[PDB]
Amino acid sequence: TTIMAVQFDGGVVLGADSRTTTGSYIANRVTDKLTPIHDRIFCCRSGSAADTQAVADAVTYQLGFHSIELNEPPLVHTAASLFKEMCYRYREDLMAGIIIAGWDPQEGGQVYSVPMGGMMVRQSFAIGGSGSSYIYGYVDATYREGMTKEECLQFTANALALAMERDGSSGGVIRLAAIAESGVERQVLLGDQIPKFAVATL
Amino acid sequence: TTIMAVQFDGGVVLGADSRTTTGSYIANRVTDKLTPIHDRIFCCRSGSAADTQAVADAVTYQLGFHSIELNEPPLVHTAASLFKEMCYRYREDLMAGIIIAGWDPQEGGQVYSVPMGGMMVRQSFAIGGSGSSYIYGYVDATYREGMTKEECLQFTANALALAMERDGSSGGVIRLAAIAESGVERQVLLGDQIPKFAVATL
Amino acid sequence: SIMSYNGGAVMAMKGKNCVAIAADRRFGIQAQMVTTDFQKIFPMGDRLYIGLAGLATDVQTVAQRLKFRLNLYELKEGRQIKPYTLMSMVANLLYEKRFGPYYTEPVIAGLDPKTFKPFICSLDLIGCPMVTDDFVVSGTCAEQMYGMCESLWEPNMDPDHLFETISQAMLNAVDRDAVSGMGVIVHIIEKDKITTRTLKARMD
Amino acid sequence: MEYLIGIQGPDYVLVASDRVAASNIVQMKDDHDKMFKMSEKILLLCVGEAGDTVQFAEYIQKNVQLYKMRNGYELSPTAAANFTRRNLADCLRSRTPYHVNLLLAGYDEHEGPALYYMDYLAALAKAPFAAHGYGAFLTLSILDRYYTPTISRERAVELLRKCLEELQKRFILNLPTFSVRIIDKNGIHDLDNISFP
Amino acid sequence: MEYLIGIQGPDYVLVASDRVAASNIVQMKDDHDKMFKMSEKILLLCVGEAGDTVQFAEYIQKNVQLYKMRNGYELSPTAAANFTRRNLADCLRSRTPYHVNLLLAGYDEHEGPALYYMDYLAALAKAPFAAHGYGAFLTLSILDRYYTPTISRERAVELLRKCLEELQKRFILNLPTFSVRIIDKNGIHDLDNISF
Amino acid sequence: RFSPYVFNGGTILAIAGEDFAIVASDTRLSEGFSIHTRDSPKCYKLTDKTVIGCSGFHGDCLTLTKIIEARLKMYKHSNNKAMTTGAIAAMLSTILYSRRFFPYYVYNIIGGLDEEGKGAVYSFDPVGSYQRDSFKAGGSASAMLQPLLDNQVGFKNMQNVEHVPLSLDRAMRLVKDVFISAAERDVYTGDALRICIVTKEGIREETVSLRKD
Amino acid sequence: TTTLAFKFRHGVIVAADSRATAGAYIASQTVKKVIEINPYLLGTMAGGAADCSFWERLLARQCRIYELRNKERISVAAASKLLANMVYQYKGMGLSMGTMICGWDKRGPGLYYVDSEGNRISGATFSVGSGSVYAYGVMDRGYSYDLEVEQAYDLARRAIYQATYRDAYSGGAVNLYHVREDGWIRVSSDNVADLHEKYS
Amino acid sequence: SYDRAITVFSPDGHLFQVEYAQEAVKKGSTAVGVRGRDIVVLGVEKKSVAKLQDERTVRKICALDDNVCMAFAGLTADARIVINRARVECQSHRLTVEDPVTVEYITRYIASLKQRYTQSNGR
Amino acid sequence: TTIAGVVYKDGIVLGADTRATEGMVVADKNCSKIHFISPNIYCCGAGTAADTDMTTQLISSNLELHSLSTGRLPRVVTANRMLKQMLFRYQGYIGAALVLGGVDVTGPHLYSIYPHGSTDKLPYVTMGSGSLAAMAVFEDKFRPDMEEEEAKNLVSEAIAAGIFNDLGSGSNIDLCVISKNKLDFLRPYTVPNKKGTRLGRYRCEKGTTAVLTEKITPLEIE
Amino acid sequence: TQNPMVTGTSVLGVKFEGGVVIAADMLGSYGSLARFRNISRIMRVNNSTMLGASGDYADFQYLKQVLGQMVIDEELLGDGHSYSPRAIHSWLTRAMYSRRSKMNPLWNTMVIGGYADGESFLGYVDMLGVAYEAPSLATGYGAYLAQPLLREVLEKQPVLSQTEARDLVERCMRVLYYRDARSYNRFQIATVTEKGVEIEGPLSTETNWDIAHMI
């Protein structure tokens, strides 16, 4: 899997592939790894599907209860902290890599990265999963400060396409989401819509 | 290690990092991985240094004897085939990833990739070593047909720099060689000469 | 396997208004027979029987625990257990130990308390119930006795024909395995009577 | 490594065991008693891993004697066999399995003589004759050869002597002396030790 | 494990061995003889892994008798001991090691009685008395207690009987009968088996 | 990591008669839980009077069949006579024991008319122990097949039944029925059944369908 | 398997079951474990049947070559040693073999027990097999050197029978062979079922 | 190795090297053997008594084994070689067969050795 | 085992084989691998058979309680969540691969549940040893908004492909159609293979088998 | 190759009237990395034969050079005899079995397809040396995925046209691209026929992905 988030001014763009695998068999080619933890907080899920689904539902439950009792929209840092506490306390028994991204009025668009082992880092762009390895260079070169929302969407699409073509575990369609004060705009890129890059073609 | 080579019209550009690691300690920070096998034929060496050096000297011995007997400049296909025969016959014993490149009168610039296990495939560009993983995306995105020698040198430098930044096993200086009908043009990028890309700010 | 340690064979068959349940008699530790009188078929009712093959210790233990549960059931509810209900009880008992399983492969054979419709089933190590209309088998020699049943069995058999079929099948099957044999006992259950016969078999 | 043998008869059960307790190679004891009287007319013979034998035997002995004191009548041999089998089987699943191989011999006024056999896995079997240990492999054929359900007790001690002198002839370990005793309606009777010098 | 014992004396060496052979839990043979007559005035007592004992012993036997045939005189006990030690040590690191524990006894006109000891690793040691097998542990201390370098041969036989009685009492395995042979200047002299 | 063996399945059976022999087998080849092909006969005509059936690792089966064919040609060239069934069996035992320390994982049955004209069936362990028998079943469903063969052909555990001599038609029906049952309750067996009848006239092939899984 | 052999005044008896098993499955109940090496000495099988058959057949051809060259039949001791030396080459390579080489020679009746481990031993009574432990006791009780030929037949037959009764992996029919100075004779082949009828 | 046919057939079908070796035997010191019912005797002619020779070293009657003996004529060194080879064969035969060697057997071994040299290459 | 499911225009169709294999011998035929959870929710099971049976029964009982209390038909998401949470708690040690299918107020829902607690909502799913062949059939011929007969034909074709190609599967085919209006549980919908006729009768006549002893105990019918 | 390094995924083949067709994706994968994405895993051994490979690509290249030299030697002899598809399949079976027997297996799983003497050959070889002929063949995960479709179609209709076979293999390749992780979009189709072996260039699967708007 490849999961990728990037922070633009006033929001975030999240992106992920649709492929989940058991060995070399693609059990689901249309999986949705971008889940709503809250109305404006999402998590990109990478690692064991069962572990990630369980932890995502638990954090959704806790953050909803916290949000209602505080009578305030929850904070992305709060969601990331809950994810960290769970993943760290169960680091031995858990195999999950999460990118927590969302928008809150206090701190704007935020992206947080929870790798395996239970640590929290805030990052301007974060990539995770098996396929992020192949696109570290592309994101390092391509990333520029102060990208627009559409520019970040194209950037995420291109990176995920590269990782998808170069990684067997990654594949399918690209699922993209843009979270901001206005709301979540979710889109799926399929077939020709997915960015394509030339082959050597001797 | 990160090695790469790219073919341009009338020649090749070769590139490599300059770090050899034993465990997590850099035994040589200025090693030369672009060994010469003939006046116009070079090998980029990745994997075990002992194995790569041994097969390189064996192959330049055989290729030199072959060239003096035939009284014509050797073919890069011949060099790649010799490397391939050695690596395949001793695939279990030696682990070595080699990118063989050079110039011939008849075929011009050629690049061949001899990964571990001794398959041989010609390639418009090749990357190898531990760091090649992290720059597959960059080379897939940025490669273009008809690149000049200077453009290929810049591409090689940028890719090797990204890989050196993101990979522990690759670091140091970038060693760059351009092989053409005229001859070898070895150059080294030290310090600020190495291309740099901004780290994420936060 | 641990199941092969003691060795056993149990069979049940369905005729017309009758059932037959048959099992070997050997008790031996990996190769050395100790006794030719082991009880592997136990009565769980007037015309309901259970047959256990596997480890001798777990055979006796699950038989005793099931009789505990069944006696409390019969006293509390004032009726005889239906065969399907005994199947479900045995499955619950075995699945209770899904980890660290009782090493047995039970077989239930009996007639319905009122309809007298015949019922045969088998359960796995961890209580997977399988109900069949022709035959069920368990033990080390499942392969041999499966083939022999698949050939010999015919639907709507008479009691005498059922006895002949089950006897031939058990004898010929236990002849071709090392760890089971030393005689075989056949119980025939009909609505009006129980007939138990011990066959003549090779003592090898 | 330890030998138990039991022969049932019309009105008796004969039991014998080797008298050796041993370290690695040294035979620390020449007169070890592996027979425990649970009650007046029942004996428990036990062999197995060291410690487990004496612990389990003593536990069953004290439970049976508690039954005697509480209820005023002795347990039946069959009931004692089922009880010790239950205790052994429960421990098998647990982290403290008693690795013990037992032979229970008894006489009941109603049900007559009985010999019971159980292995470390806690299977139980009534038998006419039985044996435990590596020597059992040698000596069972003697019993299977010369045994009769109507064997008299003099014939039984003779048969046992044949079985044991076969161990003397062929078994690798040295089991020089054996203890012998009979249970009957009168009760447990000690017999002269069958000693092969 | 089979038992070998040797007791050297002023003008003799006494050697004894258990007579059993065993497969798993059963003694297949009660009269198995573990003494090999390598020449008129030497014996080689051999215990160890099955097959290796007889094969190695017969090799040493043929070589010693060939030496006698070709030269016209017999090897001395010391030379025979060093020869078998050489052959055993040579095969220790080879593909076919002989797991064999030896006790070699002999007499020489010049050098008198000699008893030699070899381990499966092929370390050679002359000894006044020695034993092999698990029973050696039990019986050596009795030899240490009651041995004297000037022991007479009758007293030596009595000491041997003491050691074997200790084996009967304590050693778990059954070694009912023991061969006894004595080597002196006259030659190898067979003696009645000590038995229980 | 690399395992030189895989169990490709298959069942082989053979029956012998006073003037005939039968060799029969399934035609399913399957690795793991997947069928490779539904028409792979396990039975091969070594000569006019003999058939061999092989089951187990199919690579070993092919190699051993080729070896026996070559050795039969060699014997004919050297001795100017075709090999008898017993000679074939002894040679096969020798061949199998040749690789004692890296065994062929194949179960072989030799079925043919003997020199006297009687039917003869020889059954082989993988390591080359061979035994003449009136009937034998080998392969995955051997345990299923052999009890009914012992009862019907051998009249074992039956009293007050006359021991009729076996006939070609009765043996044929028994073969078809036992293979139907083994197809019913063995996963490896069932694609089809090839029956090869060896008699004085020669080999004759009969193919009957069996249950596709 | 259970095999049995002993020497008495009128020669050597050899007895064996007929069961061959693969795990629990009884592959054959009619194997001829006693191998007729040659007209004058014969062997038994225990352990690996293929190993025993192959190596004893090789011994047979070597014995015949020795007979042709030396114009005298090989002694039982010499043949046992040939077998032992043959198997010792392959020591540690997985050979499982148990054999009792039985015959006459200038010495007298001769019985030798050869093993894959390497032991070769002469004895009045031997039994090798899974049921040998059970067979040994009844054989030891019955055996005497002064024994009638019929008495020895009875002892061997009942010994193999009781061993089959106790041991799981031994069964079938009790083949019996009697070695006499002229050569071996196949005295009987009784099924253990009819023997169960007889003895009980 | 020196692979050459020292011995070959001649016209009239005679092996000249073998005949010449028999001539060499004829030159050697006499030996005589007489079989007897409870005894067998061997005698040999001292070629000359140097008066300084040690009698022990020059003996031509040698024991191949305890049960068998030999005497020879011809080249003494060749005699010594065959004697040693026969002795080792005696011991190996005893090892393999657990019985003493018979005279026919050891004679056949020596004969086979000599015949091999008459037909082998370079000997 | 092959179990498979598809969502058609107005409901779900579920399908499974009817073979139970212990090792490589067919322990049972006509086994039922389509289970009852609720009137509107049925579930196929694969993996460890006892685990499938017991977990389906437990969730059936819990949903019976839930539906009784709430007074409205149970939702499919509730079944999915109960199943996945139990399976996740047990960490795959209970071995069950489940195809969960039911219709509820929201609509038709098909869920695929793995042993470790993963779940996936899909239009079509397959599980068991024959999942790959069944998925090949589905990937080839599935189309959206199929009719009920078309969906039944597709599921039958997929389970048949699993039957013939895969060894572990093979017996009659079962189908189950859940719609908003009705349920049709179809024990054998198709019988692709049948046992052949036994040419020779081996029926043993009376007296063929010897008996050492006999005891007839009369039962007091009353 | 005790350990495969660069591997190729499923090869498929189906016999049709007047020839055979085989297809394979142009990919070599190094431990879930699509490292080499333009490689040909189909060989043209002679006019009447094709060979396609899965598994270690290095071993496939070795067998390419060996078998190419063999056919070249036959052409040098020029005696009017040429190797048949059955003959090449037999030789390959021998080679793979021998290398397995020496425990240095060639890791490949092969499909040999040819048309000679008015007859179509389609044969399989595995690294262990298992070999067989069938109307349709598939390797790797193709055995699990594509072979059901091929078997259903062939069982319904034993004999197929070239157009039907090409549509069928393309359909199966789309299924493989959907459900196989180690697969790649680009593939080549090779058909042996009376004319000869013709290998087409890279071809595309033409996927749907309409399921995404569900869920």
From Swiss-Prot, chains A, B:
Keywords: Acetylation, Cytoplasm, Host-virus interaction, Hydrolase, Nucleus, Phosphoprotein, Protease, Proteasome, Threonine protease, Zymogen. Its EC number is 3.4.25.1. It is found in: Cytoplasm; Nucleus. One of its GO terms (cellular component) is cytosol. The keyword Transferase does not apply. It catalyses: Cleavage of peptide bonds with very broad specificity. One of its GO terms (molecular function) is cadherin binding. Induction: Down-regulated by IFNG/IFN-gamma (at protein level). Up-regulated in anaplastic thyroid cancer cell lines. Component of the 20S core proteasome complex involved in the proteolytic degradation of most intracellular proteins. This complex plays numerous essential roles within the cell by associating with different regulatory particles. Associated with two 19S regulatory particles, forms the 26S proteasome and thus participates in the ATP-dependent degradation of ubiquitinated proteins. The 26S proteasome consists of a 20S proteasome core and two 19S regulatory subunits. The 20S proteasome core is a barrel-shaped complex made of 28 subunits that are arranged in four stacked rings. The two outer rings are each formed by seven alpha subunits, and the two inner rings are formed by seven beta subunits. The proteolytic activity is exerted by three beta-subunits PSMB5, PSMB6 and PSMB7. (Microbial infection) Interacts with HIV-1 protein Tat. Belongs to the peptidase T1B family. This is Proteasome subunit beta type-6.
Curated annotation (Swiss-Prot), chain C:
The modification N6-acetyllysine is found at residue 76. Its main location: cytoplasm. The keyword RNA-binding does not apply. GO terms for biological process: proteasome-mediated ubiquitin-dependent protein catabolic process. It is found in: Cytoplasm; Nucleus. Keywords: Acetylation, Cytoplasm, Host-virus interaction, Nucleus, Proteasome. The modification N-acetylserine is found at residue 1. The keyword ATP-binding does not apply. GO terms for cellular component: cytoplasm; cytosol; extracellular exosome; nucleoplasm; nucleus; proteasome complex; proteasome core complex; proteasome core complex, beta-subunit complex. Coiled coil: none annotated. Induction: Up-regulated in asthenozoospermic sperm. It comes from the Eukaryota. Belongs to the peptidase T1B family. PANTHER family: METALLOPROTEASE TLDD (PTHR32194), PROTEASOME SUBUNIT BETA TYPE-3 (PTHR32194:SF10). The 26S proteasome consists of a 20S proteasome core and two 19S regulatory subunits. The 20S proteasome core is a barrel-shaped complex made of 28 subunits that are arranged in four stacked rings. The two outer rings are each formed by seven alpha subunits, and the two inner rings are formed by seven beta subunits. The proteolytic activity is exerted by three beta-subunits PSMB5, PSMB6 and PSMB7. This is Proteasome subunit beta type-3. It comes from Homo sapiens (Human).
UniProtKB/Swiss-Prot annotation, chain D:
The 26S proteasome consists of a 20S proteasome core and two 19S regulatory subunits. The 20S proteasome core is a barrel-shaped complex made of 28 subunits that are arranged in four stacked rings. The two outer rings are each formed by seven alpha subunits, and the two inner rings are formed by seven beta subunits. The proteolytic activity is exerted by three beta-subunits PSMB5, PSMB6 and PSMB7. Non-catalytic component of the 20S core proteasome complex involved in the proteolytic degradation of most intracellular proteins. This complex plays numerous essential roles within the cell by associating with different regulatory particles. Associated with two 19S regulatory particles, forms the 26S proteasome and thus participates in the ATP-dependent degradation of ubiquitinated proteins. Keywords: Acetylation, Cytoplasm, Host-virus interaction, Nucleus, Proteasome. This is Proteasome subunit beta type-2. It is found in: Cytoplasm; Nucleus. Induction: Up-regulated in ovarian cancer cell lines. Disulfide bonds: none annotated. Pfam families: Proteasome. It comes from the Eukaryota. Belongs to the peptidase T1B family. One of its GO terms (biological process) is proteasome-mediated ubiquitin-dependent protein catabolic process. GO terms for cellular component: cytoplasm; cytosol; extracellular exosome; membrane; nucleoplasm; nucleus; proteasome complex; proteasome core complex. The modification N-acetylmethionine is found at residue 1. Its main location: cytoplasm.
Swiss-Prot record, chain J:
It comes from the Eukaryota. GO terms for biological process: negative regulation of inflammatory response to antigenic stimulus; proteasome-mediated ubiquitin-dependent protein catabolic process. It is linked to Proteasome-associated autoinflammatory syndrome 3: An autoinflammatory disorder characterized by onset in early infancy and recurrent fever, nodular dermatitis, myositis, panniculitis-induced lipodystrophy, lymphadenopathy, and immune dysregulation. Variable accompanying features may include joint contractures, hepatosplenomegaly, anemia, thrombocytopenia, recurrent infections, autoantibodies, and hypergammaglobulinemia. Some patients may have intracranial calcifications. PRAAS3 inheritance is autosomal recessive or digenic. Induction: Up-regulated in fibrolamellar carcinomas. Its main location: cytoplasm. Keywords: Acetylation, Cytoplasm, Disease variant, Host-virus interaction, Nucleus, Phosphoprotein, Proteasome. The chain holds residues 46 to 260 of 264 of the full protein. One of its GO terms (cellular component) is nucleus. One of its GO terms (molecular function) is lipopolysaccharide binding. It is found in: Cytoplasm; Nucleus. This is Proteasome subunit beta type-4. The modification Phosphotyrosine is found at residue 57. Belongs to the peptidase T1B family.
